[PDB]
Amino acid sequence: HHHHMLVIWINGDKGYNGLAQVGKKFEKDTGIKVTVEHPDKLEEKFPQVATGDGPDIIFWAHDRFGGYAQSGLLAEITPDKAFQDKLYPFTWDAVRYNGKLIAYPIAVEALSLIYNKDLLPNPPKTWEEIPALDKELKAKGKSALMFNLQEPYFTWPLIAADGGYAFKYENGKYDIKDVGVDNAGAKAGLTFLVDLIKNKHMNADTDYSIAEAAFNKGETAMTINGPWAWSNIDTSKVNYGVTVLPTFKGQPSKPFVGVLSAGINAASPNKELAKEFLENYLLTDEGLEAVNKDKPLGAVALKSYEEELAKDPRIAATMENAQKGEIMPNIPQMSAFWYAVRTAVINAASGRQTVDEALKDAQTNAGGAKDSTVQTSISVEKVLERAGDSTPFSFALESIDAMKTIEEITIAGSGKASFSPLTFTTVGQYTYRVYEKPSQNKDYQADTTVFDVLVYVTYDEDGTLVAKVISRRAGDEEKSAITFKNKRLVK
Ligand SMILES: OC[C@H]1O[C@H](O[C@H]2[C@H](O)[C@@H](O)[C@@H](O[C@H]3[C@H](O)[C@@H](O)[C@@H](O)O[C@@H]3CO)O[C@@H]2CO)[C@H](O)[C@@H](O)[C@@H]1O
């Protein structure tokens, strides 16, 4: 392909027109044409085309670049120290992979709550408030909250709030086997989101353009979006505020924070031009201002310009939300993490899977280890005729396979109780029995029934371990719950 020109890919939500203005200035000084393109799914197309026809420079959040660098698609970035000193050190950290810089950092992006001041002068502090607020607003033909549900970037902050995480970080490194998408925190967060949908406070099909149009036309009081979205809100004249995201179970929503970054194609015959453009035209006060005026960048990596932008209270809120969430890893496994979470939310939200099934598959799809055990609890009921008769009785659980007593439990009076959970790692039939110990109390004849208890461990359609408990009186072939009846002999 023809290559005398500098080709740049950037997402269609960002200020590509401003960036083209910077490219026109560079064309004047150098005679080199700059073409800015914004194809759909550029982050996916880049590794396919990177065969010629790839861009010379690609702009995306830093999370994608480890994967690009692992596959040899990116040139190493080696700016002078004089240039490095112009950007915040934590932005360089985001583009450092195996000790090498693999992009230039541009801007820090975090999601915020965006709210309509005319509809909602006091935005909710908690997610838990949102359903009641949606009832109130529905009575006036409006909704409380619409935001993009199709992309896990937008739902993650809530899923993370109470404990969800992608990869545990420990001792300078990410453990790619320690994935946090299937824990109690993730489950609680996704369950909340799904219930909002089930209770008709949000629709499963809401995507980027639907939520943007609803907010910018005054149809919904709130949305969740990044700084790039402020420009179309300005034009719409909605009277809006940008604030901290709502809390969930008292924890902050924790957005994954992206650093918009610019990488150089390892196959580009124009590396030096690309480096000249980025360092001497774009990452200057004038360069970033031209992009930012088209669509806001967020908190920019260039210290000299960020000092001006930090006065903007929308940027203070951005940084407030950024501190509460965290900077995404840049490791190759992030792609798999994201497709995993995307599948989970769409499936749970649409009712294809339960929240537990969705996140269990997400855990594996993200590269977490297959949980290959199953547990069950054997339950006992004791029945005394008199209410308030709290006479205690005890029960034993014996393994026939191992010929020993596993556990004993006590019930005072009428009641149900369970033995502690049994764990199985392999399919088969497991044999136990349960019986009541003789009573110390001479006023009662204990039930002498013995129960045979069989646990069948089988695979379900998906290869997951399943355990079913079947219990019978030792006399019989008929199934029966484990229930003992103690007769009182005294008044
Ligand atoms: O839906 C699956 C999707 O997952 C991965 O995309 C993630 C991006 O890598 C990640 O940076 C983030 O993207 C957001 C940008 O950072 C932000 O600048 C703005 O453009 O919105 C983006 C969210 O739409 O989050 C997404 C996950 O939602 C993966 O890399 C993609 O190829 C894949 O299609």
Author numbering: 8 to 57, 59 to 499
Sentences from the paper on this structure:
The host protein is FctB, the basal subunit in S. pyogenes pili. This single-domain protein has the same CnaB-type fold as is found for many isopeptide-containing domains, but has none of the required Lys, Glu and Asn residues at the usual crosslinking site. Here we describe the first successful introduction of an isopeptide bond into a non-isopeptide containing protein. We show that by introduction of Lys, Glu and Asn residues into the appropriate positions in the protein fold, together with one further mutation to generate steric constraints on the Lys residue, spontaneous isopeptide bond formation can be achieved.
The quadruple mutant N13K/V26F/Q67E/P117N (hereinafter referred to as FctB-iso) was made, and subjected to analysis by mass spectrometry. We turned, therefore, to a fusion protein in which FctB-iso was joined via a flexible 4-residue linker (Ala-Gly-Gly-Ala) to the C-terminus of maltose binding protein (MBP). The asymmetric unit contains two molecules, A and B. For Molecule A, both the MBP and FctB-iso moieties could be modelled, but Molecule B lacked interpretable electron density for FctB-iso. As in Spy0128, the isopeptide has a cis-configuration, with its C=O and NH groups hydrogen bonded to the side chain carboxyl group of the adjacent (engineered) Glu-67 residue. The isopeptide plane is stacked against the aromatic ring of Phe-24, ~3.4 Å away, in almost identical fashion to the isopeptide in Spy0128-N, which stacks with Phe-52. One difference in FctB-iso is that its catalytic Glu residue, Glu-67, has two discrete conformations, with its carboxyl group rotated ~90° in one conformation relative to the other. In our engineered FctB-iso structure, no bond formation occurred until the Val26Phe mutation was made, filling a cavity into which the Lys side chain might otherwise fold and directing it towards the Asn carboxyamide group.
